Amino acid sequence: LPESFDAREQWPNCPTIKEIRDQGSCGSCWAFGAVEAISDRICIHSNVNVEVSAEDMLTCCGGECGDGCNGGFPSGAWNFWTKKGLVSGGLYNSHVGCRPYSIPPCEHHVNGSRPPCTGEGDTPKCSKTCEPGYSPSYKEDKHFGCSSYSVANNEKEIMAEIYKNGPVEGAFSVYSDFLLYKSGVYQHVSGEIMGGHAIRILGWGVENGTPYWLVGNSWNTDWGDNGFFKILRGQDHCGIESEIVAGMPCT
């Protein structure tokens, strides 16, 4: 394994790998880390580009994935992909795909031209129809995963998984000091526990002797380092290596 690895540079034909989404004022990180990585993988292992709908995952998985905007379980999300599949859907108001995200983007712990996130958002309805004008139908726009699995809390195996099969979904404890992250390699030193946060890990590297994981947050691009952040790697910091899940697309 190389000292560094950026899925964005390794798979130039998969632009989803470099894009940052915005979960809005809804605790839907579990769904976002999932559809983002799933999007990357459909592209990696089918070479076709598809914006996997966060809306379909967030609203239709149900109990098997948790409680919608109230939080969910990453592994549960990948299961839904293999069982019910996911339709396409782009950003809020983009009219891209079968089911674009329906929750407005907002400012996540930063000032900007968007409304500030309120964290209090209701889970949207599970509607099995596509936006007007889109084709094919909801049922025919479904993309299925052929396997859902969990990678062990092992730095090397996690790297090998990313190296070989692409970005995976992870989760870690977010403390208040992470909210203000701007650059460098994040290490928890102070702040109250905010809860678990599911995200997308797409690579790793070493910055000034400090090993890290390259992560894509889902708080838009004006948060952190263009929506991404680096986090200490190798010591299960904030449990970043304790809940890695992934899967493979069919055929």
Ligand SMILES: *[C@]1(C(=O)NCCC)O[C@@H]1C(=O)N[C@H](C(=O)N1CCC[C@H]1C(=O)OCc1ccccc1)[C@@H](C)CC
């Ligand atoms: C992710 C988010 O959008 N965070 C923004 C603010 C930091 O609150 C979102 C989420 O999906 N979190 C999950 C969660 O906290 N859950 C899921 C069920 C309810 C709630 C909970 O009480 O979880 C504790 C729990 C841990 C281990 C097993 C079962 C339950 C997180 C589990 C995912 C990172």
